[PDB]
Structure formats: C-alpha cells, structure tokens
Amino acid sequence: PPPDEEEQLLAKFVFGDTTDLQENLAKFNADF
Amino acid sequence: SSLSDQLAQVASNNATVALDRKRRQKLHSASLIYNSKTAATQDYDFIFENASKALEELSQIEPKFAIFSRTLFSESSISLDRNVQTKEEIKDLDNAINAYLLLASSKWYLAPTLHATEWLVRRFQIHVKNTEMLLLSTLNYYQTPVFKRILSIIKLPPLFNCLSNFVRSEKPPTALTMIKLFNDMDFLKLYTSYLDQCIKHNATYTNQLLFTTCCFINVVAFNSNNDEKLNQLVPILLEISAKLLASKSKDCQIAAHTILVVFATALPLKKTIILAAMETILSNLDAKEAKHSALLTICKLFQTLKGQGNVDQLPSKIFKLFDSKFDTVSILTFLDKEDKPVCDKFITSYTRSIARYDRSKLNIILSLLKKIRLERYEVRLIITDLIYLSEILEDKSQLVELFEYFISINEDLVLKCLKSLGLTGXXXXXX
C-alpha cells in the first residue's frame, strides 16, 4: 500500500524533513 | 608562516559556528533592528513570525517576493543551519540570497524590508558569509540610517577597506570615501559583475543607477591625470556601458550616455572605438527620453577625437542606421534648439555621408549649413566632396544652389579649392 499525499504532507512536517525544501532551492536560478 | 597566523585562519572558516554559549551570544546578538540586549533573548521562532508577516506585505507591493516564502522564508527552513549542509547546497543558499538581495535592494527605504532581511540576516548569517552581495546591493544608501546599521554588523571584506574606519561610527560615511572605494581597480570588477548580474534580472532602479554613474564619473575624474591608469580602466567601464546599452530599460541607457561622454572628453579614444560606440547607442535606442540624451553623445563624441580622418564620411551600416533612428527633419529641429550645443565636428561628417550615399535630399544639405556656423577647414573639406560629386552625379540644379550659398560666403575658399583641383572657369561652365 503506497503512501498518499495528505499523509506525506504530514510526513515532511513531523519528521523534520527539508528534502522538500532543499529541492525547491536547486530548482530555481533566474525565474525572473 | 607562524602558528598564530595559521591558527587564526581557522577562525574565519568557523566565524558562524556557534560552539560555546558565549560564542552564540556574540553572533546571535548582532542584528539590524533590535539592540544587543533584546536580540539575544529571542528565538528564531519569534523572528520568523515578524519576517513572514512582513514578507507578505512586500509580496503585495510586488509579487516577486512570493517565491522566497516557498524556499527561504518557509516554515520548514528554520531547522536548517548553513554549517551542516554540503558544499553544493550552500552555493544554492547563496544563489537564493543573491537573487534575494536584488529584489530587496529596491524597496530598501521601506520598513518591511528591514524586518524581512533580518531573519535572513540572523538565521542565514549573511552578515558574515556573503557580505559582498549584501553590501553591493545596499551601497547606494550610504547617507541613510539603515546603511549605518549595516556597517555596525559586518566584518568588512578585504576589498571594502575604504569604509573600515566607518564601522560603528557616529556620522554616516561621507561622499568622498565612497569614491575612494570605486577608485580601486579591483572593487570596480565587483561592481561590473554586480551590475551585469543586476541587468539580467531587469531589476535596476533609478536611484541605484544614478549612484553607479555618479561614482563612475568621478573615477574618471580622479584619474584624469594618469594616462596609464585610464588605459587600464576602460575594459572595466566600457564593457559595462556596452552591456548597459543592451538593456530594454530606457533608464539604463541614459546612464551609459553619462559614462561615455565623460570618458570621451577625458581621454581621446580611437576613431574605431567611437564608431563602435555610436552603433550600440543607435542600435537599442527605442524610447523618447533616451533619444535626446543619445543625440548629445554623438554631438559630443565626434568632437572629442581629433586627428587624421577626424571628419571622415560615416560607414554605410552606420549612416542609414542613423537615418533610421534620427530623422533629417528631427536633426534640424535639434539645431534650432536655443541650448544650441556644439554640433560642429559631427555634422560635417554627417553632411559628407549624405553627399556620397543618399544624394536624394540636398535641399536639407543647404538648410543644415544656415543653422550652424561651421569651422574654416570643415567648409573646405565639404566643398571638395561636392565638387567631386558635381562631376560624377548626373547634373542637377539644386546642387548649383548649394554653391550659391558658398558664392555668398567665403568666395575665395570656393576658388582656392578649385585652384587646387580643376579650373576656375570650368565649374561655372558646368552649370
């Protein structure tokens, strides 16, 4: 059984994850 | 070297690493808004409330700050310390904050940017790690009280050693000491690489872009003696003004005119460089208010140089481009201005190019000469071309009326050029 989204939103919050945050850093260079 | 030299080199690399409590109470205590006692007693959680509440106001002023709340000003970005992360991840934290201080630098008089950057000061340690792009973004506010606070935190880099006497000083850093910064040949090479980075994002604002040139004029001014110093200076300044003309913005283009005209009067540039500069001024010249400033460059640029080929005909790609952006009627309304600038050495190169390339409109070539009192050698150098044109062109009555203007004034000048080339009776026989 795979994890859903709204429980995985609870995952990155409760486990103290920054992997969602760290990927948003390397995604952008000159978005303007 | 010695021991204490190498062992103070470790101190710079761990300038942010909080090790003892007293080390933390010195690093965390410094900030932009709160004084040294009330700053040390508050969480990052407290600071993030005031920042994210303020940053949503800046997103209302312009929507560009909305992206940083996803990455830097997000709630998950409290746990991340710089020191824990790898070397590739830190450069992305720099390239976010370097992208941040561009957008931040414009709205810097406003109160919400002071509460916004402070969390990016105190959590992300930009007053130690990257204080070049912190200071280069905010280098134009030297009179303001907000830059006096910015000095009261930063350990100054080795390139900003001129301001090092103004750190935690009473009075603001004065206007000449800002010039002693820009007088260095290395500090300019930042402020190029800051500006060409700042143009690519197309966020260059009016008060900033004045203070660039108002320093870049003075650097040419303080070095107007040392001809060696100027010779090594224009790979720095003219490569800006080349890239500063490539801007879509009309406001950036007028700044390139201020640096070009000032440097051209201070150093006689070559003919090929001035014709190079005159194309790039012509090529990206779109708006109204950029055109008026652009015409007073070529008015002034052609008078700076003087030598053989001073009054040469313009090249083909140059001239029709100049006819494309500047009209032959609009150049006449320009000469009728009661400012009446010295348009003297350019138009005698403009008129000769008409005589060779276009030739359809020589009604104008009379009316050009009534409006400007020319120089002595220029009129001779014009009339030689028209007499060459008199033989070659399929003979025309309006060309006869041009010489009637020179039968009116300087009759012997018409004779002496005919006595140099050709016959006296043969020209009047030709018409």
From Swiss-Prot, chain A:
Note: Present with 9570 molecules/cell in log phase SD medium.
Shown part of the complete sequence: 13 to 44 of 594
Subcellular location(s) of the protein: Nucleus, Nucleolus
Function text: Involved in nucleolar processing of pre-18S ribosomal RNA and ribosome assembly.
Annotated protein name in UniProt: U3 small nucleolar RNA-associated protein 18
Organism: Saccharomyces cerevisiae (strain ATCC 204508 / S288c)
Quaternary structure and partners: Interacts with snoRNA U3. Interacts with MPP10, UTP21 and UTP25. Component of the ribosomal small subunit (SSU) processome composed of at least 40 protein subunits and snoRNA U3.
Family affiliation: Belongs to the WD repeat UTP18 family.
Swiss-Prot record, chain B:
Residues where N-acetylserine is found: S1
Gene: UTP10
Taxonomic superkingdom: Eukaryota
Source organism (scientific name): Saccharomyces cerevisiae (strain ATCC 204508 / S288c)
Localization, UniProt: Nucleus, Nucleolus; Mitochondrion
Source taxonomy: Eukaryota, Fungi, Dikarya, Ascomycota, Saccharomycotina
Membership in a protein family: Belongs to the HEATR1/UTP10 family.
Biological function: Involved in nucleolar processing of pre-18S ribosomal RNA. Required for optimal pre-ribosomal RNA transcription by RNA polymerase I together with a subset of U3 proteins required for transcription (t-UTPs). Involved in ribosome biosynthesis.
Record protein name field: U3 small nucleolar RNA-associated protein 10
Assembly mode: Interacts with snoRNA U3. Interacts with MPP10. Component of the ribosomal small subunit (SSU) processome composed of at least 40 protein subunits and snoRNA U3. In the absence of snoRNA3, forms a complex with other t-UTPs. This complex can associate with pre-18S ribosomal RNAs.
Miscellaneous: Present with 18200 molecules/cell in log phase SD medium.
